[PDB]
Amino acid sequence: TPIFAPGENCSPAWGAAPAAYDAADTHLRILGKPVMERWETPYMHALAAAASSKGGRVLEVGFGMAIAASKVQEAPIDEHWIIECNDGVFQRLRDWAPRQTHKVIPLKGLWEDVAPTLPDGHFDGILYDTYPLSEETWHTHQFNFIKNHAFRLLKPGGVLTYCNLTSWGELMKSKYSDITIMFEETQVPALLEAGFRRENIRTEVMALVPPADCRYYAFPQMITPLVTKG
Numbered sequence: 001t002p003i004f005a006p007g008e009n010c011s012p013a014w015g016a017a018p019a020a021y022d023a024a025d026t027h028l029r030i031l032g033k034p035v036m037e038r039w040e041t042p043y044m045h046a047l048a049a050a051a052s053s054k055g056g057r058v059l060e061v062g063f064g065m066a067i068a069a070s071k072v073q074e075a076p077i078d079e080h081w082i083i084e085c086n087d088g089v090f091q092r093l094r095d096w097a098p099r100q101t102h103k104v105i106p107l108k109g110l111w112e113d114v115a116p117t118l119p120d121g122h123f124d125g126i127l128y129d130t131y132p133l134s135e136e137t138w139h140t141h142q143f144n145f146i147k148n149h150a151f152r153l154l155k156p157g158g159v160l161t162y163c164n165l166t167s168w169g170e171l172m173k174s175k176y177s178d179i180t181i182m183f184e185e186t187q188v189p190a191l192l193e194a195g196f197r198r199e200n201i202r203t204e205v206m207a208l209v210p211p212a213d214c215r216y217y218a219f220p221q222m223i224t225p226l227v228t229k230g
């Protein structure tokens with residue numbers, strides 16, 4: 001069964017949907033979707049290192065299991081802004097934020113609603129890792145954020161990192177056997193359209209074998225984008 005059915009739209013229901021964190025604290029499911037899993041930890045650490053590489057003000061979109069967020073907090077940053085839609089996940093963010101070393105700025109809502117309220121050229125780093133909220137935005141939800149907000153929000157020299165594992169897992173099953181080719185063909189044109197220059201786009205590949213029973217990702221490598229504003 002596909003994660004999304006034809007014409008499925010979960011966006012208006014995401015906020016009020018109960019957040020299901022299992023007792024073993026290894027997964028997060030919302031509306032029966034596999035939103036986050038702890039096997040992703042080394043990869044979440046690579047994204048966190050990329051978004052926090054310039055220090056200063058870091059914007060993180062999607063809180064999930066706080067894996068990337070706890071790694072961002074290990075870097076010498078000044079502010080950690082976090083946008084989260086789901087009420088259940090936001091309560092976990094609310095409990096996590098006080099004990100953190102670097103000031104956390106928690107904001108509740110869809111980035112579609114919250115990001116327009118954020119100041120232009122204010123962030124040294126951006127980490128985008130949400131989840132598709134509709135079948136037709138399965139491979140493209142990150143592009144809407146990158147085009148409308150990532151470029152304007154970054155300071156000159158600022159770094160954007162992001163991922164979309166539901167998309168990339170699928171594209172690595174049939175269409176591609178080389179993860180850098182997959183990135184070049186499916187991601188680079190939208191980033192160029194967003195205002196980023198090709199010479200300012202790099203990628204880091206890392207070895208990570210997912211579990212055998214993982215339906216949404218099977219490729220034994222992960223790709224970390226580093227998209228710098230000119």
Ligand SMILES: Nc1ncnc2c1ncn2[C@@H]1O[C@H](CSCC[C@H](N)C(=O)O)[C@@H](O)[C@H]1O
Pocket residue numbers: 014030035036044061062063064065066067068069083084085086089109110111112129130131132133
């Ligand atoms: N449009 C949107 N705006 C804000 N948050 C969203 C969103 N769509 C999904 N979310 C939230 O995005 C998150 C994706 S899971 C993120 C996992 C995180 N990188 C970690 O390391 O633990 C979830 O908390 C989900 O509720």
